[PDB]
Each structure stands twice: as structure tokens, then as C-alpha cells.
Symmetry: C2
Subunit: 92 residues, 2 copies
Amino acid sequence: VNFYDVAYDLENALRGSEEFTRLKNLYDEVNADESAKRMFENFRDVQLQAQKTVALVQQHEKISQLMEAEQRMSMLIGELNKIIMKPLEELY
Amino acid sequence: VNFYDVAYDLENALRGSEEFTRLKNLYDEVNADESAKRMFENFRDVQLQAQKTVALVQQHEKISQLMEAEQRMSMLIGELNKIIMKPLEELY
Ligand SMILES: [Ca+2]
Ligand SMILES: [Ca+2]
């Protein structure tokens, strides 16, 4: 099959996953909370005193849950990459 | 559908692609050439005077073709990632 055809099926799988729904719900929940929205945004912005700002946000339970869901999404993408890149690892 | 189910279909798509076959053929061709194998290996090894070693290998046509095929494979993985991560970009 075509690599791009499958990639679009994989995008759909991600779009439809409970994991994406959970991340989206946390993201919306944080944005609906005026205090949390501001803290999360100032955190995001400071990443382009750091370290920081990370302490500010980690002390907030709901924002921490969102950040944890972000890191788990990053881990998932990492897993997908390890899966699909196996033939390259075999080669080298 | 399940994200992992599709990821394994995508691994199969990559395994079966002419692009993978081309990379593998170049890799094997370089390794079958005693002089080129040594240059490519010393290059790979120097990456963990650099810059370098990169000049050594780029002056060899066949090794350069392999390195170009590597970079195009990296670009392909990049494209797949951009595709599947679109729902995340929409969210943020
Ligand atoms: Ca917690
Ligand atoms: Ca050339």
C-alpha cells in the first residue's frame, strides 16, 4: 500500500482516539479557566526564569494533568516513530 | 481504527516501498565497496574535525547518493509526522 494513504488512515485513528479526546478536553478545560489559561499561556510563551515558570505551572493540578497528557501524546508519537522506523534500524 | 494497528500497516508500507529498496541498495553498494565502506563508517563514527569528515564523504559520489537517500528518508518521516500531528496543530 501507499505510505501516504496509510499515514492519512493513521491521522484518522489519532483524530478518533480517546487519547486525543482527553487531551482536547483538558486543553479546553484549562482555557475555560481564566486563571489557569493565563498561567499555561505565560508558560508556553516563555518557551521560545525558565525553569521555572515550569514550577509555577506544575503546582496547579489541572494544568499538570494537561502537561502530563501532552507528554503522553509526545510518547505516543515517539512509539509510532519507533514502530515505522524499525526497517531502518534493521538496515543500519 | 486502532492507532497501533494502522502504525503496523504503515511500517509495512515503508518496508515495501521502492524508497526503502533504493536506500537499502545504496547502503549495500557502499558496504560492498571496501574504500567507501571505510569512509562512510568513519563518518558515522565521528558522529557521536567533524565538519569535516563531512567533506571527505561528500566528495565521493556514491556515498553522497546514500547520504542524500538518508536525508530524503528523514524528510519522508518528517512528512508522515506532520500529517498525523495535524489534529494537534489544530488544537493549539
Ligand atoms: Ca497531579
Ligand atoms: Ca552527486
